[PDB]
């Protein structure tokens, strides 16, 4: 329930909510920290990390 996005160029983008891989557009959609809807070329994304939360 805490997603992290790894980019092919090394960056380790934190996010708010689960990103969206649209294979129909070749785009990954996401919200960052300031409530901003963003889009990044799927191609520049290498991994989608879900960090499970535990009580």
Curated annotation (Swiss-Prot):
Question: Which residues are connected by disulfide bridges in this protein?
Answer: none
**Localization in the cell:** Cell membrane
**GO CC terms, sorted:** plasma membrane
- Kindly state which keywords UniProt assigns to this record, in alphabetical order: Cell membrane, Lipoprotein, Membrane, Palmitate, Signal
Q: How does the record say this protein sits in the membrane?
A: Lipid-anchor
The text of the family note is: To E.coli YgdI.
User: What name does this protein carry?
Assistant: Uncharacterized lipoprotein YgdR
Which species is the source of this protein?
Escherichia coli (strain K12)
* Span within the parent record: 22 to 72 of 72
């Amino acid at each position: 329930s805490d997603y992290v996005m790894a980019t092919k160029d090394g960056r380790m983008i934190l996010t708010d909510g689960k990103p969206e891989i649209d294979d129909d557009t070749g785009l990954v959609s996401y919200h960052d920290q300031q409530g901003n809807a963003m889009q990044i070329n799927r191609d520049d994304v290498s991994q989608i990390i879900e960090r499970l939360e535990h009580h």
